[PDB]
Tab-separated table of C-alpha atoms in Angstrom:
chain	number	residue	atom	x	y	z
A	2	UNK	CA	0.516	0.104	0.075
A	3	UNK	CA	1.006	3.620	0.108
A	4	UNK	CA	3.278	4.665	3.169
A	5	UNK	CA	5.076	7.223	5.123
A	6	UNK	CA	7.882	7.321	6.074
A	7	UNK	CA	10.791	9.492	8.252
A	8	UNK	CA	13.612	10.691	6.390
A	9	UNK	CA	17.017	9.557	7.938
A	10	UNK	CA	19.312	12.717	8.888
A	11	UNK	CA	23.111	12.353	9.339
A	12	UNK	CA	22.655	13.843	12.500
A	13	UNK	CA	19.975	12.115	14.141
A	14	UNK	CA	20.667	8.998	13.308
A	15	UNK	CA	24.475	8.133	13.672
A	16	UNK	CA	25.067	4.586	12.800
A	24	UNK	CA	10.938	2.550	8.719
A	25	UNK	CA	12.957	4.885	7.547
A	26	UNK	CA	13.562	6.401	4.222
A	27	UNK	CA	16.753	8.009	2.438
A	28	UNK	CA	17.305	9.424	-0.733
A	29	UNK	CA	20.087	6.721	-1.334
A	30	UNK	CA	16.913	3.991	-0.697
A	31	UNK	CA	14.881	6.103	-3.445
A	32	UNK	CA	17.527	7.247	-6.327
A	33	UNK	CA	20.441	4.565	-5.235
A	34	UNK	CA	19.170	1.424	-6.671
A	35	UNK	CA	20.269	-0.757	-9.680
A	36	UNK	CA	16.927	-1.307	-11.001
A	37	UNK	CA	16.096	2.201	-11.397
A	38	UNK	CA	15.798	3.537	-15.250
A	39	UNK	CA	14.848	7.304	-14.745
A	40	UNK	CA	13.423	9.691	-12.365
A	41	UNK	CA	11.314	13.011	-12.718
A	42	UNK	CA	11.927	15.448	-10.463
A	43	UNK	CA	10.091	18.635	-9.013
A	44	UNK	CA	11.014	20.510	-6.332
A	45	UNK	CA	11.872	23.858	-4.538
A	46	UNK	CA	16.129	24.027	-4.648
A	47	UNK	CA	17.719	21.611	-6.056
A	48	UNK	CA	21.527	21.232	-5.179
A	49	UNK	CA	23.157	19.271	-7.875
A	50	UNK	CA	26.096	17.721	-6.635
A	51	UNK	CA	24.157	16.724	-3.351
A	52	UNK	CA	21.347	15.129	-5.080
A	53	UNK	CA	23.293	13.435	-7.853
A	54	UNK	CA	25.446	11.327	-5.800
A	55	UNK	CA	22.555	9.952	-4.551
A	56	UNK	CA	22.372	7.897	-8.109
A	57	UNK	CA	23.578	4.214	-8.915
A	58	UNK	CA	25.134	4.296	-12.283
A	59	UNK	CA	22.769	2.189	-14.169
A	60	UNK	CA	20.153	5.623	-14.634
A	61	UNK	CA	19.847	6.747	-17.539
A	62	UNK	CA	17.649	9.389	-17.589
A	63	UNK	CA	16.963	12.132	-14.645
A	64	UNK	CA	14.342	14.987	-15.473
A	65	UNK	CA	14.225	18.136	-13.308
A	66	UNK	CA	11.345	20.499	-13.054
A	67	UNK	CA	12.377	23.460	-11.164
A	68	UNK	CA	12.038	27.331	-10.593
A	69	UNK	CA	15.037	29.028	-13.027
A	70	UNK	CA	17.238	30.410	-10.664
A	71	UNK	CA	16.906	27.233	-7.783
A	72	UNK	CA	18.837	24.841	-9.929
A	73	UNK	CA	22.561	25.042	-8.583
A	74	UNK	CA	25.016	23.596	-11.109
A	75	UNK	CA	28.226	21.823	-9.795
A	76	UNK	CA	31.605	23.508	-9.840
A	77	UNK	CA	34.255	22.312	-11.790
A	78	UNK	CA	36.423	22.205	-8.374
A	79	UNK	CA	33.496	19.997	-7.131
A	80	UNK	CA	33.184	17.947	-10.416
A	81	UNK	CA	34.380	14.404	-10.594
A	82	UNK	CA	34.532	10.949	-12.515
A	83	UNK	CA	31.099	9.644	-11.198
A	84	UNK	CA	29.581	13.049	-11.574
A	85	UNK	CA	30.629	14.045	-14.960
A	86	UNK	CA	28.779	10.323	-16.417
A	87	UNK	CA	25.609	11.140	-14.150
A	88	UNK	CA	25.459	14.692	-14.869
A	89	UNK	CA	24.824	13.625	-19.087
A	90	UNK	CA	21.635	12.013	-18.352
A	91	UNK	CA	19.663	14.885	-16.696
A	92	UNK	CA	17.468	16.922	-18.739
A	93	UNK	CA	16.138	20.553	-17.215
A	94	UNK	CA	12.919	22.082	-17.463
A	95	UNK	CA	12.955	25.362	-16.188
A	96	UNK	CA	10.492	27.321	-15.382
A	97	UNK	CA	10.317	31.151	-14.921
A	98	UNK	CA	8.098	32.628	-12.568
A	99	UNK	CA	6.156	35.823	-11.670
A	100	UNK	CA	7.872	37.862	-8.649
A	101	UNK	CA	6.724	36.404	-5.175
A	102	UNK	CA	5.697	32.923	-6.804
A	103	UNK	CA	7.395	29.751	-6.103
A	104	UNK	CA	7.500	26.101	-8.025
A	105	UNK	CA	6.840	24.733	-4.504
A	106	UNK	CA	5.821	20.973	-5.771
A	107	UNK	CA	7.925	18.053	-4.482
A	108	UNK	CA	7.321	15.252	-6.347
A	109	UNK	CA	9.308	12.287	-7.417
A	110	UNK	CA	8.435	9.913	-10.371
A	111	UNK	CA	10.050	6.752	-10.509
A	112	UNK	CA	9.978	4.137	-13.721
A	113	UNK	CA	11.994	1.025	-13.170
A	114	UNK	CA	13.742	-1.591	-15.306
A	115	UNK	CA	10.024	-3.895	-15.391
A	116	UNK	CA	8.309	-0.903	-16.461
A	117	UNK	CA	7.183	-0.259	-12.589
A	118	UNK	CA	6.447	3.049	-11.440
A	119	UNK	CA	6.839	4.421	-8.029
A	120	UNK	CA	6.020	7.840	-6.569
A	121	UNK	CA	7.578	9.779	-3.727
A	122	UNK	CA	6.438	12.869	-1.795
A	123	UNK	CA	9.238	14.008	0.382
A	124	UNK	CA	8.913	17.131	2.389
A	125	UNK	CA	12.658	18.720	1.687
A	126	UNK	CA	13.797	20.386	-1.250
A	127	UNK	CA	16.694	18.640	-2.891
A	128	UNK	CA	19.705	19.840	-0.632
A	129	UNK	CA	21.787	18.789	2.178
A	130	UNK	CA	20.956	20.547	4.846
A	131	UNK	CA	17.399	20.627	3.986
A	132	UNK	CA	17.582	17.286	4.046
A	133	UNK	CA	19.716	16.738	7.260
A	134	UNK	CA	18.315	19.291	10.178
A	135	UNK	CA	14.827	19.962	10.145
A	136	UNK	CA	12.693	16.933	10.595
A	137	UNK	CA	11.234	15.931	7.335
A	138	UNK	CA	8.589	13.000	5.916
A	139	UNK	CA	8.306	10.853	2.417
A	140	UNK	CA	4.851	9.777	1.534
A	141	UNK	CA	5.522	6.342	-0.771
A	142	UNK	CA	2.909	5.369	-3.145
A	143	UNK	CA	2.607	1.761	-3.897
A	144	UNK	CA	4.016	0.418	-6.518
A	145	UNK	CA	2.455	0.769	-10.327
A	146	UNK	CA	2.808	-0.863	-13.478
A	147	UNK	CA	2.925	0.071	-16.449
A	148	UNK	CA	-0.183	-1.341	-18.261
A	149	UNK	CA	-3.547	-0.473	-19.939
A	150	UNK	CA	-5.697	0.692	-17.638
A	151	UNK	CA	-9.745	1.063	-17.342
A	152	UNK	CA	-11.138	2.711	-15.106
A	153	UNK	CA	-9.967	6.563	-14.394
A	154	UNK	CA	-8.644	6.920	-11.293
A	155	UNK	CA	-9.194	10.132	-9.858
A	156	UNK	CA	-5.681	10.791	-8.478
A	157	UNK	CA	-3.918	9.982	-12.442
A	158	UNK	CA	-6.455	12.364	-13.067
A	159	UNK	CA	-5.661	15.055	-10.874
A	160	UNK	CA	-2.205	14.169	-11.769
A	161	UNK	CA	-2.354	14.822	-15.543
A	162	UNK	CA	-4.796	18.492	-14.504
A	163	UNK	CA	-1.289	19.273	-12.748
A	164	UNK	CA	0.783	18.730	-15.488
A	165	UNK	CA	-0.955	20.064	-18.180
A	166	UNK	CA	-1.678	23.211	-15.850
A	167	UNK	CA	2.095	24.024	-16.756
A	168	UNK	CA	1.171	24.528	-20.372
A	169	UNK	CA	4.500	23.813	-21.370
A	170	UNK	CA	5.456	21.263	-24.047
A	171	UNK	CA	8.638	19.727	-22.493
A	172	UNK	CA	6.074	18.395	-19.601
A	173	UNK	CA	3.907	17.374	-21.705
A	174	UNK	CA	6.320	14.810	-23.707
A	175	UNK	CA	8.826	13.933	-21.711
A	176	UNK	CA	6.586	13.541	-18.231
A	177	UNK	CA	2.933	13.714	-19.160
A	178	UNK	CA	2.678	10.834	-22.044
A	179	UNK	CA	4.798	8.516	-19.842
A	180	UNK	CA	3.178	9.088	-16.348
A	181	UNK	CA	-0.015	8.292	-18.898
A	182	UNK	CA	1.088	4.766	-19.621
A	183	UNK	CA	1.140	3.841	-15.794
A	184	UNK	CA	-2.008	1.726	-14.810
A	185	UNK	CA	-2.918	3.623	-11.521
A	186	UNK	CA	-5.304	1.424	-9.591
A	187	UNK	CA	-3.048	0.771	-6.634
A	188	UNK	CA	-3.789	4.435	-6.019
A	189	UNK	CA	-7.930	4.342	-6.196
A	190	UNK	CA	-8.176	5.678	-2.853
A	191	UNK	CA	-6.440	8.556	-2.441
A	192	UNK	CA	-6.887	11.940	-4.120
A	193	UNK	CA	-4.143	14.387	-5.502
A	194	UNK	CA	-4.662	17.672	-4.243
A	195	UNK	CA	-2.783	20.920	-6.138
A	196	UNK	CA	-2.177	24.196	-6.207
A	197	UNK	CA	-1.518	25.640	-9.522
A	198	UNK	CA	-1.454	29.389	-10.787
A	199	UNK	CA	-2.862	28.472	-13.981
A	200	UNK	CA	-6.302	30.418	-14.551
A	201	UNK	CA	-7.832	27.956	-16.436
A	202	UNK	CA	-7.383	25.169	-14.105
A	203	UNK	CA	-8.893	25.661	-10.634
A	204	UNK	CA	-7.044	24.575	-7.798
A	205	UNK	CA	-5.931	25.068	-4.453
A	206	UNK	CA	-8.064	26.386	-1.759
A	207	UNK	CA	-11.829	26.581	-3.890
A	208	UNK	CA	-10.679	23.305	-5.338
A	209	UNK	CA	-10.177	21.197	-1.964
A	210	UNK	CA	-13.266	22.935	-0.662
A	211	UNK	CA	-15.789	21.634	-3.769
A	212	UNK	CA	-13.928	18.220	-3.064
A	213	UNK	CA	-14.285	17.998	0.743
A	214	UNK	CA	-17.566	18.738	0.091
A	215	UNK	CA	-17.999	16.344	-2.648
A	216	UNK	CA	-16.655	13.303	-0.467
A	217	UNK	CA	-19.547	14.451	1.978
A	224	UNK	CA	-22.902	16.687	18.403
A	225	UNK	CA	-19.630	15.505	17.944
A	226	UNK	CA	-16.068	17.876	19.585
A	227	UNK	CA	-14.229	18.561	15.406
A	228	UNK	CA	-10.902	19.133	15.129
A	229	UNK	CA	-9.063	20.860	12.932
A	230	UNK	CA	-5.156	20.500	12.937
A	231	UNK	CA	-2.592	22.539	10.617
A	232	UNK	CA	1.146	21.730	11.055
A	233	UNK	CA	3.102	24.202	9.152
A	234	UNK	CA	6.351	25.869	8.529
A	235	UNK	CA	5.123	29.074	7.337
A	236	UNK	CA	2.497	30.524	8.913
A	237	UNK	CA	0.784	33.796	6.402
A	238	UNK	CA	0.134	37.093	7.942
A	239	UNK	CA	-3.374	38.736	7.950
A	240	UNK	CA	-5.360	38.170	4.725
A	241	UNK	CA	-6.616	41.771	5.144
A	242	UNK	CA	-4.911	45.178	5.760
A	243	UNK	CA	-7.518	46.588	7.788
A	244	UNK	CA	-8.361	43.676	10.246
A	245	UNK	CA	-7.119	40.622	11.510
A	246	UNK	CA	-7.975	37.603	9.725
A	247	UNK	CA	-5.992	34.063	9.721
A	248	UNK	CA	-6.297	31.442	6.561
A	249	UNK	CA	-6.831	29.037	9.113
A	250	UNK	CA	-8.811	30.134	11.796
A	251	UNK	CA	-11.370	32.824	9.947
A	252	UNK	CA	-11.417	31.264	6.446
A	253	UNK	CA	-10.379	27.393	5.863
A	254	UNK	CA	-11.977	26.037	8.798
A	255	UNK	CA	-15.544	28.234	8.593
A	256	UNK	CA	-15.346	26.415	5.302
A	257	UNK	CA	-15.367	23.368	6.233
A	258	UNK	CA	-17.384	23.095	8.743
A	259	UNK	CA	-20.210	25.040	6.804
A	260	UNK	CA	-19.957	27.865	8.826
A	261	UNK	CA	-19.913	30.137	5.682
A	262	UNK	CA	-20.851	28.834	2.349
A	263	UNK	CA	-19.143	30.301	-0.843
A	264	UNK	CA	-21.735	32.517	-2.456
A	276	UNK	CA	-15.669	36.569	6.341
A	277	UNK	CA	-17.012	36.360	9.747
A	278	UNK	CA	-15.640	39.188	12.553
A	279	UNK	CA	-13.510	37.576	14.682
A	280	UNK	CA	-16.281	37.421	18.197
A	281	UNK	CA	-18.898	35.760	15.841
A	282	UNK	CA	-16.199	33.109	14.946
A	283	UNK	CA	-15.283	32.602	18.005
A	284	UNK	CA	-18.881	31.879	19.178
A	285	UNK	CA	-19.915	29.661	16.689
A	286	UNK	CA	-16.535	27.492	17.486
A	287	UNK	CA	-17.618	27.500	21.141
A	288	UNK	CA	-21.317	26.954	20.020
A	289	UNK	CA	-20.045	23.689	17.258
A	290	UNK	CA	-17.423	22.699	19.474
A	291	UNK	CA	-14.968	23.205	16.636
A	292	UNK	CA	-11.073	23.105	17.823
A	293	UNK	CA	-8.518	24.222	16.085
A	294	UNK	CA	-4.766	23.341	15.766
A	295	UNK	CA	-1.754	24.903	14.520
A	296	UNK	CA	1.350	23.155	15.141
A	297	UNK	CA	4.352	25.057	14.846
A	298	UNK	CA	7.919	25.246	17.258
A	299	UNK	CA	7.964	27.201	20.348
A	300	UNK	CA	10.917	29.496	20.876
A	301	UNK	CA	12.255	26.963	23.790
A	302	UNK	CA	11.914	23.844	21.772
A	303	UNK	CA	15.250	24.809	19.916
A	304	UNK	CA	16.791	24.669	23.754
A	305	UNK	CA	15.768	21.391	23.290
A	306	UNK	CA	16.758	19.944	19.704
A	307	UNK	CA	19.876	18.606	19.386
A	308	UNK	CA	21.206	20.946	17.131
A	309	UNK	CA	19.641	24.003	18.710
A	310	UNK	CA	18.784	26.911	16.510
A	311	UNK	CA	20.335	24.822	13.586
A	312	UNK	CA	17.048	24.106	12.229
A	313	UNK	CA	15.175	27.412	12.706
A	314	UNK	CA	15.813	29.090	9.278
A	315	UNK	CA	12.986	27.384	8.059
A	316	UNK	CA	10.261	28.293	10.354
A	317	UNK	CA	8.792	31.678	9.037
A	318	UNK	CA	6.004	33.369	11.211
A	319	UNK	CA	6.585	37.329	11.119
A	320	UNK	CA	4.476	38.393	13.420
A	321	UNK	CA	6.415	41.056	15.321
A	322	UNK	CA	5.185	43.921	13.129
A	323	UNK	CA	1.357	43.135	13.254
A	324	UNK	CA	1.705	41.737	16.826
A	325	UNK	CA	-2.567	42.160	17.888
A	326	UNK	CA	-2.725	39.185	14.958
A	327	UNK	CA	-0.281	36.816	17.189
A	328	UNK	CA	-2.328	37.654	20.401
A	329	UNK	CA	-5.523	36.756	18.156
A	330	UNK	CA	-4.506	33.158	17.156
A	331	UNK	CA	-2.383	32.874	20.279
A	332	UNK	CA	-4.934	33.996	23.396
A	333	UNK	CA	-8.192	34.830	21.694
A	334	UNK	CA	-8.586	31.170	19.552
A	335	UNK	CA	-5.932	29.145	21.476
A	336	UNK	CA	-4.593	27.786	18.373
A	337	UNK	CA	-0.917	27.019	19.154
A	338	UNK	CA	0.160	23.503	20.137
A	339	UNK	CA	4.150	21.763	20.648
A	340	UNK	CA	5.713	18.922	20.889
A	341	UNK	CA	4.911	16.495	24.107
A	342	UNK	CA	8.504	17.172	25.334
A	343	UNK	CA	8.044	13.329	27.424
A	344	UNK	CA	7.186	11.430	23.706
A	345	UNK	CA	10.134	12.867	21.581
A	346	UNK	CA	12.914	10.558	21.066
A	347	UNK	CA	16.340	11.965	22.756
A	348	UNK	CA	18.094	11.656	19.053
A	349	UNK	CA	15.199	14.035	17.379
A	350	UNK	CA	14.235	15.609	20.516
A	351	UNK	CA	11.755	18.889	19.870
A	352	UNK	CA	13.520	19.508	16.537
A	353	UNK	CA	10.239	20.757	14.431
A	354	UNK	CA	9.445	19.217	11.106
A	355	UNK	CA	9.349	20.732	7.627
A	356	UNK	CA	6.046	18.476	6.563
A	357	UNK	CA	2.772	20.186	5.776
A	358	UNK	CA	-0.616	18.232	7.148
A	359	UNK	CA	-3.942	19.219	7.543
A	360	UNK	CA	-6.398	17.307	9.406
A	361	UNK	CA	-9.768	16.720	10.452
A	362	UNK	CA	-11.019	14.301	13.443
A	363	UNK	CA	-14.492	14.127	15.131
A	364	UNK	CA	-14.653	12.660	18.569
A	365	UNK	CA	-17.788	10.924	20.179
A	373	UNK	CA	-5.372	12.089	24.115
A	374	UNK	CA	-6.310	9.209	21.794
A	375	UNK	CA	-7.716	12.408	19.148
A	376	UNK	CA	-6.519	12.155	15.555
A	377	UNK	CA	-5.917	8.084	15.757
A	378	UNK	CA	-9.173	7.891	13.335
A	379	UNK	CA	-9.461	11.069	11.295
A	380	UNK	CA	-11.886	11.591	9.128
A	381	UNK	CA	-9.605	12.951	6.616
A	382	UNK	CA	-5.351	13.862	5.915
A	383	UNK	CA	-3.915	16.222	3.399
A	384	UNK	CA	-0.088	15.740	3.074
A	385	UNK	CA	1.232	18.425	0.932
A	386	UNK	CA	4.219	21.108	0.050
A	387	UNK	CA	1.613	23.552	0.309
A	388	UNK	CA	2.244	26.144	3.744
A	389	UNK	CA	-0.865	27.948	5.603
A	390	UNK	CA	-0.306	30.809	3.234
A	391	UNK	CA	-2.787	32.606	0.758
A	392	UNK	CA	-0.048	32.740	-1.182
A	393	UNK	CA	-0.134	29.032	-1.706
A	394	UNK	CA	-3.701	28.198	-1.422
A	395	UNK	CA	-5.286	31.269	-2.922
A	396	UNK	CA	-8.924	32.206	-1.223
A	397	UNK	CA	-12.773	31.887	-2.450
A	398	UNK	CA	-11.603	34.923	-5.096
A	399	UNK	CA	-7.607	34.485	-5.675
A	400	UNK	CA	-6.182	31.655	-7.307
A	401	UNK	CA	-2.730	30.233	-5.749
A	402	UNK	CA	0.264	31.751	-7.121
A	403	UNK	CA	2.541	28.933	-6.375
A	404	UNK	CA	2.737	25.805	-7.663
A	405	UNK	CA	1.917	22.541	-4.912
A	406	UNK	CA	1.018	19.135	-4.393
A	407	UNK	CA	-0.039	16.811	-2.011
A	408	UNK	CA	-2.023	13.408	-1.188
A	409	UNK	CA	-5.416	13.657	0.484
A	410	UNK	CA	-6.600	10.537	2.378
A	411	UNK	CA	-10.458	10.475	2.878
A	412	UNK	CA	-12.486	8.532	4.884
A	413	UNK	CA	-15.362	7.834	2.693
A	414	UNK	CA	-12.745	7.104	0.030
A	415	UNK	CA	-11.461	4.183	1.543
A	419	UNK	CA	-13.625	3.024	7.507
A	420	UNK	CA	-11.420	6.008	9.322
A	421	UNK	CA	-8.279	6.720	8.387
A	422	UNK	CA	-5.998	5.997	10.738
A	423	UNK	CA	-2.697	8.143	12.395
A	424	UNK	CA	0.500	7.269	14.241
A	425	UNK	CA	3.194	9.527	15.446
A	426	UNK	CA	6.788	8.424	14.414
A	427	UNK	CA	8.170	8.961	18.166
A	428	UNK	CA	6.882	6.031	19.148
A	429	UNK	CA	7.879	3.198	16.492
A	437	UNK	CA	0.331	-0.544	10.439
A	438	UNK	CA	-1.647	2.661	9.759
A	439	UNK	CA	-2.732	4.767	6.823
A	440	UNK	CA	-0.915	7.676	8.294
A	441	UNK	CA	2.550	8.691	9.976
A	442	UNK	CA	3.483	12.216	11.646
A	443	UNK	CA	6.509	13.414	13.064
A	444	UNK	CA	4.761	15.330	15.866
A	445	UNK	CA	3.751	13.411	19.047
A	446	UNK	CA	0.286	12.423	19.611
A	447	UNK	CA	-1.007	14.079	21.833
A	448	UNK	CA	0.218	17.439	20.741
A	449	UNK	CA	0.400	19.949	23.969
A	450	UNK	CA	-1.592	23.340	24.021
A	451	UNK	CA	1.074	26.361	23.965
A	452	UNK	CA	1.303	27.127	27.772
A	453	UNK	CA	-0.153	31.150	27.885
A	454	UNK	CA	1.746	31.781	30.722
A	455	UNK	CA	5.541	30.939	29.110
A	456	UNK	CA	5.434	29.966	25.181
A	457	UNK	CA	6.014	32.019	22.284
A	458	UNK	CA	5.985	30.935	18.961
A	459	UNK	CA	9.325	30.972	17.227
A	460	UNK	CA	10.122	34.244	15.645
A	461	UNK	CA	13.013	34.787	12.865
């Protein structure tokens, strides 16, 4: 089946888990198609076996670091010749944020990964990272259309590039996606012709169709207010109101929402590292550069989230491993759990994605995303409940690198880490 793994780090695992070497190092690998936000080529290319025939790399212009002559050697020179580069030029303040790997093997087998790390050394090793691994797929004719496959193809088409159409999309077409018939592929694209992001994910949740209602986000970037005049958070003021039916598409005052949350027993959660969690990380502030929440200029927005919604959660310090401590994770997850401690072990749905909690990644009801983003959605009604566990205790549908349970910020002491 599909499986979530925790990425091994050179620092945290000194002498299940995955590495880039287990993904790219296998002698039966014929071809990889890579999508990422940054590529350190001498680090990535060292991961591959000498048997590989083609490496196709889709990335944003300026984010593909060439190897300097002084770093070249005999091995890399050979592998470098097998790289085909597809460079996307993006508008300002937009990102090719998707991370995706499509491998093709000798037998005609295909495997897909969503890693949470970009292909650089520091990113692979410092913050915690995960990797979603698809089941094994086979080149073969297919019968029934598989939603995951179909949304993957829309996503590729939305780049509108000849090289993607010919070099990637046609090879993906040949793959039978039946082993993935339960899952959905959810994405953002800046393409104006293809809907995507929040609006599309909302419609898809509506279509897939008393209790306490838990909506948890784990994200390495928290965007600023949706409006300049008022304090409006994407999770608490737009996403959660939409998913619960508090608002329909044709934004409420804060006080109305707080009351609606009491009354409907909606419990919002954002997992984001405190200031103090770096103290108890084994590389201390080494992983902190990846955690973006810039709230000092608009302090009331933060206060609102921290004190009125009480939205912030942190790791359970008593459950983390010694070797990883409270090192925060650069994965992104969005999940919903209905109850009526054990919260989040059985889910209504869970999205694992490259998308951060920002308007540029998601869009809004009326704005389109600016980024490319991709992820995989597990929905109860598509399977009977989605099962989830924490890697800190290490067979469930999902595994997450934060503790379960997560613990509310202590309002007397904890502050979101502010870079």
